[PDB]
Amino acid sequence: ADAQRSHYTVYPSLPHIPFVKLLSGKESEVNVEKRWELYHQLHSHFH
Amino acid sequence: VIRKFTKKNVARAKKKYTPFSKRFKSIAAIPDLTSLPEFYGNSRFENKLKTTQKHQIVETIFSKVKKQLNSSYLPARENEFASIYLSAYSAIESDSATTIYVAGTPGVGKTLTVREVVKELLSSSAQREIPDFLYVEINGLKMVKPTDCYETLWNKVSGERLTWAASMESLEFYFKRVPKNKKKTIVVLLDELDAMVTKSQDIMYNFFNWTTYENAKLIVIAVANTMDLPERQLGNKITSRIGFTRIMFTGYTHEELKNIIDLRLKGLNDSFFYVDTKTGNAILIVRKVRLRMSADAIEIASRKVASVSGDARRALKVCKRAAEIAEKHYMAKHGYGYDGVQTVHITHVMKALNETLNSHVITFMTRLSFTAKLFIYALLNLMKKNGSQEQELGDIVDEIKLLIEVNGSNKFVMEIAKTLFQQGSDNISEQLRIISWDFVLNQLLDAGILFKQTMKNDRICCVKLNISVEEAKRAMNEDETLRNL
């Protein structure tokens, strides 16, 4: 049992932005992508 | 490259790292090690300590006696000899591996008996009643490191020089895997076994676990101080492997010590010598001088030594010291330098025996100065009043001051108070310590009379007597001044 050990490395299996759809799920995906790009262009401009 | 420290005195031995288990292809490929040139042992420094003598040195009558009583040059060890010889002979004859445990007090003839057993076994193997064997002797106190035993024994077996871990695996492989028809019996004496005890007991377990192996053909004679050394300092595995049948070397009785000394002095006691009166040189067969050492003196020396220790070294040294005392008196009275009846008497034996019995502690404290005696006396007063067995140094300072100022009508104190507190001088102020205060403190610490605590405050540092109180009082009762007050 790896839970009974000190440190163990695992490799997850695999078979893309963290922004969610607003307006109770009625907002389009293009508005989500635009909001992502606008957040990054303000964030980079500040930093 | 800039080095953070340097080790510029490294002395590394030319010892290889490959063990015996990796120099042949298999177990069945190992050749017969008995028919090998380097295996089983098949002095260059003796010339360096020789010089030319250009004086005829004068050996008196007592010189042969004193050379005779040396430990370097067995009436009482016949059952221990029989037991060790029977066990070793049975293990050599049957190709068996075994342990023989021997223990005893110093000087009771353990090493001598084991070496005589080994010499008699070699004599038996010379005329072919037992198979040939190798003899290895390992003293635990003659090793720089305890693991050097691993380096020693393998070097006596194979003739190779390896490091200690590689030697240990080589010995393990040789004892476990090499067949008995391919090897030779080895008898190893482990002398001073308590010096081979480590914190993890690796060497002890390895040496007594190789004896439990079938193919080993190893006989280990382990010589120790006490019977209960495995039961005190070793684990239950090593105590189980050593065994239960353990051989006691008890101390000698006075008859045995007397027989040992008489067997030393067998040819020269009650004998005749040709002695040149001008020089004192004695020649065994100008005056014919009859030499004797009395049996009563030897007897009581044997009785005293046997009651104390049973040590043959001590009895031989007491007799040799008596002979030295007699020779010193003889050369004093005859005017003999270094280039009808001579008797080593009983008074010389009693002078030799009492010389290690007279105590110089009271004699030393009797001949100290007045200030050291005053220190000891004030310390005894503090131990009398407060009863602590450890007194502060400031308390000793104030008690010395009080003893000076109370007995200020004593004539000696009136004559010496200016010496203790001004060194007999005007222009020297009244001092807080007496003159030679730290001198007598360090003198009593050097002699081992006192113990001083490690503190940097001089007043509350404590001082304890290391000797008994009555001999200190006795020494204080000899002095005429400290008796009066």
């Binding site: 049992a1 009974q4 050990r5 | 029989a82 037991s83 029977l86 066990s87 049975s90 293990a91 004859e93 049957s94 068996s96 591996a97 075994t98 342990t99 007090t105 871990a165 240990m168 695996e169 393990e172 914190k199 993890s200 690796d202 390895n206 676990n209 004896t211 439990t212 192996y213 079938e214 080993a216 684990g235 239950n236 595995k237 105590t239 189980s240 492997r241 065994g243 239960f244 049948t245 353990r246 009651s307 104390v308 220790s309 049973g310 019995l357 007279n358 105590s359 502690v361 450890e390 113990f451 605590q453 404590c462 001082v463 304890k464 290391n466 000797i467 008994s468 109180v469 009555e470 001999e471």
Partner: protein
């Protein structure tokens, strides 16, 4: 001769003569049940063998790998019985330098080829991962770390054990350890009793033509070598000593077993061999040790002078004469002189007197003498 052959069989190094020990059938069957369960199902598990010294754990397991069995690959017969290839090795742990190197010792026991550095169990796990393997760790009590907190001391050993409880690894651990010196399945080897030792002795010298021992002598030796911590090595040494005593004085009976047990094994006789000066010193030593119990020779001599002056029995003697009588009682066994460090404000090494004699027999011997009764 028959005596030399009997002593050769009675050594600790003698050859063990289907493949089970005479008095160890149940443990042998349990070990084979473990091996048949782990090898056929190809499971990862861990065995742990407990016992007192000389109970036959090493002998039975060496019998198992000798009879019933990439180097160390051996063919093994199942209870079903097709075949199996299994890498079984037996690593003694005292020959290890470091306890953390055992994985490397596990690796070098199996390979020829490549040589890769193993400093943890992970390299061992990835080495054994693409493949079963049995390691027999004898004297595994060496694998505990000294001067290390409980946790870090058990540190390596559970890494030996938890890898034995991992899926998809082909690892079987059989760890034989001594109980007296110190989850996996535990097998205990109980110390032998008298009938088991009798059966072992008769079966082990069944090779010899003529039995030189009497049977009741062997039963008496087995009964005397029994109870808690029952060692078969002790029985072998007792029989070998009986043969040695017999041929030194010249069948073997009860009297020679008693001769061994009296030869190789009391404070009433020690006191009785003393004069009145030495009995006086032994009385003042014990009286001084009631008051202090950490008292030097000078403090023991300190008490003796005060006891004389209130009694005036015998002339008072010097300090070095006192230490000589203490050396005489050291030789007699009544006194045990050690040098240890005192534990006051000033710490140095001092010599102090210890007594371990029986106090019940001390008061009986001294109350008969009237002048010594003030000194109790």
């Amino acid at each position: 001769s028959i005596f030399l052959r009997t002593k050769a069989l009675l050594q600790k190094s003698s050859e063990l003569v289907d493949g089970a020990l005479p008095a160890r059938t149940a443990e042998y069957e349990q070990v084979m049940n473990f091996l048949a369960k782990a090898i056929s199902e190809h499971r990862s598990d861990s065995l742990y063998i407990t016992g007192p010294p000389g109970t036959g754990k090493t002998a039975q397991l060496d019998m198992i790998i000798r009879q019933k069995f990439l180097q160390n690959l051996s063919w093994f017969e199942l209870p079903d019985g097709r075949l199996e290839s299994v890498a079984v090795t037996s690593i003694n742990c005292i020959s290890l330098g470091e306890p953390s190197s055992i994985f490397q010792k596990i690796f070098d026991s199996f390979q020829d080829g490549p040589t890769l550095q193993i400093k943890n169990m992970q390299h061992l796990q990835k080495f054994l991962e693409p493949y079963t393997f049995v390691v027999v760790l004898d004297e595994m009590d060496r694998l505990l770390h000294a001067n290390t907190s409980e946790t870090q001391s058990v540190r390596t050993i559970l890494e030996l054990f938890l890898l034995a409880k991992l899926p998809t690894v082909s690892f079987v651990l059989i760890g034989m350890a001594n109980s007296l010196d110190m989850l996996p399945q535990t097998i205990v080897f109980q110390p032998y009793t008298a009938e088991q030792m009798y059966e072992i002795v008769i079966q082990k010298m069944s090779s010899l033509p003529t039995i030189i021992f009497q049977p009741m002598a062997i039963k008496f030796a087995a009964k005397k070598c029994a109870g808690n911590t029952g060692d078969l090595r002790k029985l072998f040494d007792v029989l070998r000593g009986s043969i040695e005593i017999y041929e030194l004085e010249k069948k073997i009976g009860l009297n020679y077993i008693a001769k061994v047990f009296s030869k190789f094994v009391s404070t009433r006789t020690r006191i009785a061999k003393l004069n009145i000066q030495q009995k006086l010193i032994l009385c003042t030593i014990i009286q001084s040790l009631k008051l202090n119990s950490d008292a030097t020779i000078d403090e023991s001599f300190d008490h003796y002078i005060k006891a004389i002056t209130k009694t005036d029995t015998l002339a008072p003697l010097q300090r070095n004469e006192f230490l000589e009588i203490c050396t005489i009682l050291e030789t007699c066994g009544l006194v045990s002189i050690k040098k240890t460090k005192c534990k006051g404000k000033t710490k140095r090494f001092v010599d102090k007197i210890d007594v371990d004699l029986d106090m019940r027999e001390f008061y009986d011997e001294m109350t008969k003498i009237s002048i010594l009764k003030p000194f109790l």
